[PDB]
Design a protein around this nucleic acid. Sequence first.
RNA 1: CUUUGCUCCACACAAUAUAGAUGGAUACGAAUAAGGCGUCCUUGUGGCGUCGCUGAACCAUAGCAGGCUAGCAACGGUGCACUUGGCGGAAAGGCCUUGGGUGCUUGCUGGCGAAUUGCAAUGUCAUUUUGCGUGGGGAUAAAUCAUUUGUAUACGACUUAG
RNA 2: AUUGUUGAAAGGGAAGGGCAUUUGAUCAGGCCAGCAUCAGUUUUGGUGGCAGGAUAAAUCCAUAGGAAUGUAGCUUG
Lengths: 136, 197, 189, 172, 106
Amino acid sequence: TDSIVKASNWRLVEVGRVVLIKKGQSAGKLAAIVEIIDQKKVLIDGPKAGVPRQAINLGQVVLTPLTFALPRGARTATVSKKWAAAAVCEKWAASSWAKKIAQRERRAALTDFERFQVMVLRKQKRYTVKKALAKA
Amino acid sequence: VEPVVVIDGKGHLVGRLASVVAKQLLNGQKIVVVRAEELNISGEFFRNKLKYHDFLRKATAFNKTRGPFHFRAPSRIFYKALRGMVSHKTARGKAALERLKVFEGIPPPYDKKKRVVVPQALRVLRLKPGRKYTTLGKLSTSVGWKYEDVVAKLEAKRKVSSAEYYAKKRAFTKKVASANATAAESDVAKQLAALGY
Amino acid sequence: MKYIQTEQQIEVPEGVTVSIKSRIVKVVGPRGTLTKNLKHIDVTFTKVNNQLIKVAVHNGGRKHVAALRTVKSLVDNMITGVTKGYKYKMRYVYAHFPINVNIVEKDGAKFIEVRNFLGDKKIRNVPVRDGVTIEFSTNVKDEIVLSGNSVEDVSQNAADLQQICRVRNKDIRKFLDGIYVSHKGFITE
Amino acid sequence: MAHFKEYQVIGRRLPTESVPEPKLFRMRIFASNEVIAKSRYWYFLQKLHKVKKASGEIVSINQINEAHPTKVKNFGVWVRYDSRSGTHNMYKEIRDVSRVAAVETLYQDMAARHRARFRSIHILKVAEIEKTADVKRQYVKQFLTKDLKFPLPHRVQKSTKTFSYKRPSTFY
Amino acid sequence: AESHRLYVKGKHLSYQRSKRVNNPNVSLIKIEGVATPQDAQFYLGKRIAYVYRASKEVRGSKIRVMWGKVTRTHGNSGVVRATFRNNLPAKTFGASVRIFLYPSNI
RNA sequence: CUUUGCUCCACACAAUAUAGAUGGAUACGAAUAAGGCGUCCUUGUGGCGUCGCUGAACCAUAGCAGGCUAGCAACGGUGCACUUGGCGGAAAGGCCUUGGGUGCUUGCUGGCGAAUUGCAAUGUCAUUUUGCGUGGGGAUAAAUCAUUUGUAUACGACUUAG
RNA sequence: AUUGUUGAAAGGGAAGGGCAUUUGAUCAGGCCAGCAUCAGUUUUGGUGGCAGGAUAAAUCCAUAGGAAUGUAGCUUG
Ligand SMILES: [Mg+2]
Ligand SMILES: [Mg+2]
Ligand SMILES: [Mg+2]
């Protein structure tokens, strides 16, 4: 009938690939790939976030699933125009990945009183959840 | 953090795992290693067999019972690697090695306990893909270990029991994750989401 | 130099159906089914359409990229075997002593038995690998014909037979006796 | 050496009474600081001209920054170096955003592939290859194809802790 | 609650030393959760106790204590140096110590 | 079968001394050029969706080291002892389950207590091992020497018999 | 020297010794700490103002010219 090979559905280093910088002074910010230098280096640019145009080792970055249309070697203003058109910031903020990053940041920020309030609320949510597991 | 750590030896590199275990014990952490028969060594099988034969050649000439002793079982090959990375002739070193146990397969009581891995020693994260490697059970059998088949029979049985356990927990995890989803869109759940929970 | 991308194409013909998952290839055609574990190579298979599979290496050295065309051939031969099949012909060669070949059973096993090789009283036995089919051609004198889906099984079984009849302690330029492969080919042509 | 800068260094023989305004010679020198740049300047001048630091003077040393430090360029680089046996010329090609980045790579390469230390190497010329047709090396050419994409298979995330409670995935 | 702990857990790893000479006047302590010297800076000056048990009751207890303080960081991995009023005994390499949260600067 | 010896259990009371408790060792297997989870159906090397980018988790967690009391709402959670049935021999000595009992409940709302350890001092809460005394059960031998044998033997040892 | 008895203690192919502390035993004549404000020496952070250079180079803006790993449009297939 039909053949059925799988895939392996990799994120590609390509012009327009959005990346989350992991190491350095821009760490945590997004940036687009603008040109490919070699197997390990790429030129990135993150005008919105304030990541300066720069050559960077792919080891310092994590490829995200987001890509947007961008000409090879686009200058910063062009990157900035196409980025906001493509709605890259909002697409990122909707991801489970971004939400986890945010959650981790939120929990880290909690006051000792807020931690106390959290315990009291979890005790409450637990009461009702465990009541529902008894029925079903 | 845990009062005993149970490392699943499978898929780890002998030396890199040995080096981490040795340091943990010297720092006063009890460790158990299981599935020592599934441990790897970089280098093709033949090379590693040749190295083991070089080791077998070594013996006290005037009386072979005076050592060195050539243990063949996977667990004891791992123990040899470890013993070499600890000052095992001192009282501190003897104490450190009392904090360690190594087993082929996963005997009781450790069969019903969580098993961790050591990423700095995982073969799949360490070796360049394409590089050849030995599995320690095969090596041990070739140099005279006798219980490869018994361990394999016992491990097949344990995995049947374990798959049944998992099937049940995976079912109970649905009921929970379902009941947690109905709890969302309550006032309490929305309040918790504000505070990062 | 690491090549960014090398790629081979595998042409799937009408009757045959290639399944691939974690590098375990199953081919299924008219003549039957073959499988092949390729977990010993880092390649990526991809379906273009129902008639074309691509196989690619990314960022590969000279030795890695050499493997890729091997992978193409091994999968192509699986497909040939399960449509056209494989058929190796072997002739017997002898000055004086007629080599005497026939199939036997040793506990429902199957064995190519070779008697009288250079007048030897030893009886030579060669297992018939599973999925290989032996037959003695009538039109041609002193010809055995091995055949099967798997070229690796067929070809090895012929080599098993060629090699059992090696001549010892004699000058093999003179003593040319043996059972040699005369023709590699397909069943349907 | 280190992370390289590029310097213009300009020197001359000291004025005599006979020759009150000697000819100025300029070099571009890659070096990690000015002190080394001046030393290299004399090292090379003395191979070319009858002059030496004692009988000469540096008139200027100026760092030369890259004109377009975030344009990707293909550089040709001509090199002379000493092997253990002899002395060889070599052309290599390097793709980078600056001459200074190209030279860092060149030096690292010659060390890796030919075991040539800094002392053993002379950079004869470094030049941006203006057109893609003129790139002569397959290892550069392959990065100049249209709509180049590629995956990074087999990702290894470095762990902070010694133990991990799940087998890791190498997916990307 | 179940927990009553107002200290961070640590382990006595070693005396300060070169390859072949130790200095018992300084101990090295690994504090749980501290992976860098930057993080270890928080614990500088905090009091440490090694608590241990004895057979003979003295001044109405069978528990004894050796007090010290964290003095500075050690290496790149969040180990700290510490000094005790009397030096820690070498038998305790691998033993647990308690890093208190006083004197406080929060 | 008499210094009431031996043993087990419960309970005190002593000593003992710790390679080092201080909320929880929180269980699939397999792959990694691939997987997990959910879902659907022609049940497949299936379709669809979703997750990862570390446990920075999850669970637990408020009360004289956690007191004494009054209600509300649920009929849930949890401890202890006791029962029901089952499964576990790799070192099983544990996992699960029935039923009722008895506490506790911070799911929610009240009342009373806490001081002077004096501005910190581990400020004592764990875990072994053994003895000793009470009460309750339970059990009622051997080995060695000496003698003896010669399948044994320098002597011990060995092998026999009484 | 060497020995007996008693008492105490340790003992996986010597024993003995140095530095340090734990434990036990023993013993003579203020003892042990905490915080604040300083001083001497030093270590590790946060943050402010200035100077230079191609009075950084860039980005950015304006403008002239260009091409290709040739965008739109167009023409064929
Ligand atoms: Mg043997
Ligand atoms: Mg001859
Ligand atoms: Mg001061």
